[PDB]
Design a binder for this molecule. Structure first.
Ligand SMILES: *[C@@H]1O[C@H](CO)[C@@H](O[C@@H]2O[C@H](CO)[C@@H](O)[C@H](O)[C@H]2NC(C)=O)[C@H](O)[C@H]1NC(C)=O
Lengths: 47, 50
């Protein structure tokens, strides 16, 4: 039977809402390009 | 015996001798959890010798 009895009070209804949203987005692009050449020429006059 | 008036809404009930109370203590708890996760990773190379 518990510890107390109700001497007075109100009756009715309780309505509660908790609603939570958490979005994260990440996009990352890394690009690297390397171009190298050598050229050489030798000759005299015939070679 | 018994035959004390017990009502729920307009419907009146006869309580069993054994039962101390049967009472409409209405309550409701909803719970919704949605977790979506994505990962993508891309790797390329292009390499040439002449
Ligand atoms: C490797 O080379 C290919 C071909 O050039 C690259 O794909 C091309 O990229 C260009 C520019 O983005 C587009 O216009 C072409 O339509 C693509 N063609 C094809 C078949 O994919 C590709 O991006 C290069 N990758 C690296 C890492 O250098």
């Amino acid at each position: 039977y518990g510890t107390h009895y109700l001497q007075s009070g109100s009756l009715g209804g309780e309505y509660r809402v908790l609603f939570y949203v958490d979005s994260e987005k990440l996009k990352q692009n890394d690009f690297n390009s390397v171009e190298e050449k050598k050229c050489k020429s030798s000759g005299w006059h015939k070679f | 015996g018994g035959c004390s008036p017990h009502y729920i809404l307009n419907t009146r009930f006869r309580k069993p001798y054994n039962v101390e109370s049967y009472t409409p203590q209405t309550q409701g708890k909803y719970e919704f959890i949605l977790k979506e996760y994505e990962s993508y990773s891309d790797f390329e190379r292009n390499v040439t010798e002449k």
